Amino acid sequence: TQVFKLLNKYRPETAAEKKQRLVAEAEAVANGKVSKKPYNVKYGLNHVVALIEAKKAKLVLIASDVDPIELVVFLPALCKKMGVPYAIVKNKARLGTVIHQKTAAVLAVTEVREEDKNELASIVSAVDANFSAKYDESRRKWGGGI
Amino acid sequence: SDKRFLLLFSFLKRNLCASVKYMAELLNYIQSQLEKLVSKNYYLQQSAKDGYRSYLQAYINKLDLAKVAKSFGFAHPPNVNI
Amino acid sequence: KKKGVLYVGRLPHGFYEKQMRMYFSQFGPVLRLRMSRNRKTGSSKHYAFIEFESLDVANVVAETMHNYLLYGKLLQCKVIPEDQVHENMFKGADVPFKRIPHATIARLQ
Amino acid sequence: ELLGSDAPLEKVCSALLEYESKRKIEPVWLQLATLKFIGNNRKLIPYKIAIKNPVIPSSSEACLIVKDPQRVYKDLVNEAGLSKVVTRVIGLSKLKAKWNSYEQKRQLRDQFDIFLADDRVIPMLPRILGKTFYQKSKVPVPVKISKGTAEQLKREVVSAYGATYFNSAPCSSFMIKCGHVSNTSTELAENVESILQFVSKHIVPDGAKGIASIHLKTSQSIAIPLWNNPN
Amino acid sequence: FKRAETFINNYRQRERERIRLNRSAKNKGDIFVPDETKLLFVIRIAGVKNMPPKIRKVLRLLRLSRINNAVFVRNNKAVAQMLRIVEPYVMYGIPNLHSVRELIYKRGFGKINGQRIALSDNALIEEALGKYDVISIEDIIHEIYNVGSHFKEVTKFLWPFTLTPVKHSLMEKKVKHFNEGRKAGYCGEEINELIKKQV
Amino acid sequence: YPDYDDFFTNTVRETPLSSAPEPKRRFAPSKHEQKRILQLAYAIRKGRI
RNA sequence: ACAAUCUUCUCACAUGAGGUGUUGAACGAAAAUAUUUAGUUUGAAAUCGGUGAAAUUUUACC
C-alpha cells in the first residue's frame, strides 16, 4: 500500500483529461497566445524493459500473476543485472488501475518531482530490506514440491 | 575520481578538444544540481557525453569509470565504446 | 515463563510511550516500558525498550515490525538476549517523564 | 558615556587588537551581562543592528527566501542587478516541499553564506528550516522587500549586508558579534558603541542601568571587561 | 484491530490541536466579533478521538456532546471566544428567519421532564413554558429569532437537533467519509443553504 | 532440481545496454500533441468542436 | 481517515512596538554567569543511563 500510495500521485492522465487539457490550448491558440516535463509512471512491457536497460528506471514493480509467465520470468534477473531495485507486487489488476487500464504486466518509476524524491528513496530502501534483503536465498530454491 | 570537477569548480570560484568544449559549456551555464542540469539540457548533454568519450579514449582498466562519469556530471557511466 | 525484552529503533515522531503500549498490548500484555528521552528537555531519542512476558512473544514482534516502513522510517526491532540486559532499562518506566523548565526557574530564582 | 557616564573604549579596543596580533579572521564578540533576563523565552528572529563597519564579508553569497511566486522576486533580482550578491531566491512554498529531509536541508544550508528572508515569511521560517539551520549558527534576517521595487530590494540588501545579526534567547548574558580582527580598532569601537546604543534602546529593558558588565574578546580570547557599572 | 499508524495520527493531531490552543489564547486574545446578528448558529462537524481535555469540557458547555448536534447561541464577547477556541471542530454562521423556522417546525425537539420528547403538542410547550410567556411553537421561533428575555430559558428547554449528513445519490452512498464537504470555521449565510439542503 | 545458479547476473552492469544517443524528442515539447492541438484549433475555427 | 490549521504579516505612527515556533547523537570554544554560548561530522542516523484539573491516582509540551 505504501508503494501504491506514491504511485497514485504519478498516474498518467486519462484520455478524458488528455483532451480537456488539449482543448484549452486549442482555444488559446484559436484566440491568441512553454511548460514543464510531464511527470507520471512508466508502464508497458517493451517500454519498461527498455528503460531498465537504459538505466532510466528507479524502481520496477512486477505483476505477480502474468498469464504466460514467459513475459516477466526474465525480469528479476535483468533488473538485478542493471541494479534496478525491483519488487513483485501482488496482482496485475492493482497495477492496472494505477494507469487506467484493465491490467499492467509491469510498472516502473523513472523520475519523480523533488517534493516526492525523499518518499521514493524511503520506499526503495524498504523494498531492499523487505523484498531483496529477505528471501534472496529462497529465490534460488526450486519452489513447490509441497 | 568522482570529485575532480568539484575541486576545479571550487578553486576557480575562489580565485575568480571536446573535453575543453564541455568544460566551457557547463561553466557558461553555471553535485545533484550539476547532474540535474545536464540530464535536462539536450545540447549540454551531447557535449557531456562526447567529453567522456574523448577523455576515456585519450587515457584503461585502472580508472574507475563510474566515478569518471560522475566527474563529468552524469548519473551513470554512458555506453561509450572504449 | 522467561521475561522477554524487546528493543525498537528509528521511532517516528509520535510513537511515544502511550502509543506503543496501546499497540503492543493487543499483541500481548506489556509490563515495563521505557522510551529513551533527552535529559534536558525530555525530547525523544527515537528508540525505546519494551518487555514481554515471554521471549516467544518477544520474538513474535521481532519478525513482523522489523523493517516496518513507518512515516518514512524503517522500524528496527529485534530481541535482545538476556545475557547482556542491564538492571534498569525500565528505571522510571510507565511514569510521565519529568521535564523541568530550567530557563524559567532560573529567571524566577 | 551612556553606560556609566564614561567611555573607556578605543584604548581597550586597540590593546585587544595588539594582544590578538601578539598571540599569533577571528570574530570580535562583545560579552554583556544584564541584571535581569533580556528575554522571557527564546526569540528566533534576527536583530537588525546596523553598524558602520559590517561583519558580513562583501564576498558572501546571499539567498533571499521570498513569498510565492518566486518568479516575481527572481525578475526583481534580475532587474536590480543584485545577482552578484543575491545568489538564489526560493519561494516559501518551494522551500517547504523541495527541501524536506535532514540531509537535503543541510546541503541547502551549506550551499550559501547568508540566508536573508522576506518580512512576511520570517514567521513560518522557524519551521521548514529545523534545528539544522536555526541552531547551527545560521539564522535568517528580516530583509524588508515588501515594497516590491528594485530600489527597495537594493536598499534592503545593502542595509542587511551592513548590519549585524543577533538572536536573543531567554538568559541573563549574551554575546554579540562586533567585527573581525582585521577590522580597524576605530571601526570596531564605533561598531561596539553602535551596538551598545541598540542594546540599551531595544534590547536591555532598563537600558544602560540594566547592563551589569561589558567585556570584549575574540572566539578563543579572554573577555577583557571594557567597563563596569559603578552602582 | 488498530494499526500503528492511527496511534501516530492521533498524536500528530493532539500536538497540532494543543499548539493551536496556545497560540489562540496567549498573545491572541482578540476576536473579530461577527456583527449585525444577535443570534448565531453552530453545528459540530467532527471530533478527534482521545479529545483534548479543554475542548472536551467546552463542547459539553455548549451542549454539543455528540456530533451533528445543532445549537443556537446568542452572539456576545464570551460565546464567540469559546467558539474561537473550538473553531476547527464547528461550522458556524447566521441563520435566516426561514431557516430557523423549518428547524423548529421539522426538527425541533423538547426536553419535557428530561426525556427525548418531540415538540408534537403546543399544550406541552405551554405547560413547561407558560410562566415565561411561551405558549406555542410560533412563540418559540419569535422569541429565538428576537432573542428576548426568555431566550436563555427557551434554549435550555430546546433539545439539540441532529443534522446527520444526507445520502441520496449513488455517488454519496459509496464515497468514503462523505460529509457533504463540510469545512470548519465561518461560513456566513452558507449555513442557511446547508440547512436548506439538510432541512 | 539444483539450486539456482547466476553465472551472469552476480555482477551489476554499470553502462546502459544501448549506445545510441538520446534523440531530441525527449527534450522538446511533444510534436504529437501539436498535431492534436492544431487539429483542435482548426475545428474550433471551422466550428466543429 | 501514514488525511487534518506552524501563520505568503499585524499595531501605533517615514518610524516604533510586535510575530513563539527548533529530530537525535558524537568531537570539541572558554567566557559572561543552571541559561546562552566557536567551529564541526551525520540516512529525521540511535541498543541502560515548580505548577495543577479531574476520579488515594490520571496526566507522555502544564
Residue numbers in the entry:
A (entry chain G): 88 to 120, 125 to 237
B (entry chain D): 320 to 335, 346 to 359, 473 to 501, 512 to 534
C (entry chain o): 102 to 210
D (entry chain K): 5 to 28, 50 to 256
E (entry chain t): 51 to 249
F (entry chain m): 199 to 247
What sentences appear in the manuscript?
Here, we answer these questions and reveal how the nascent 60S moves from chromatin to the late-assembly compartment in the nucleolus of Schizosaccharomyces pombe (S. pombe). In vitro, Fkbp39 binds DNA and nucleosomes but dissociates to bind nascent 60S particles and to partition them from chromatin through LLPS. This partitioning provides directionality for the nascent 60S to move into the nucleophosmin-rich GC, where its biogenesis continues.
To determine the assembly state(s) of the nascent ribosomes associated with Fkbp39 in vivo, we determined the cryo-EM structures of the particles pulled down with Fkbp39. We identified 4 major states of nascent 60S, and each state could be further classified into multiple substates. The nascent 60S associated with Fkbp39 represents early ribosome biogenesis stages. The variations in composition and conformation among these structures suggest that 60S assembly can occur through multiple pathways, with states 2 and 3 representing intermediates in parallel pathways for RNA domain III incorporation, which can occur before or after ITS2 is processed.
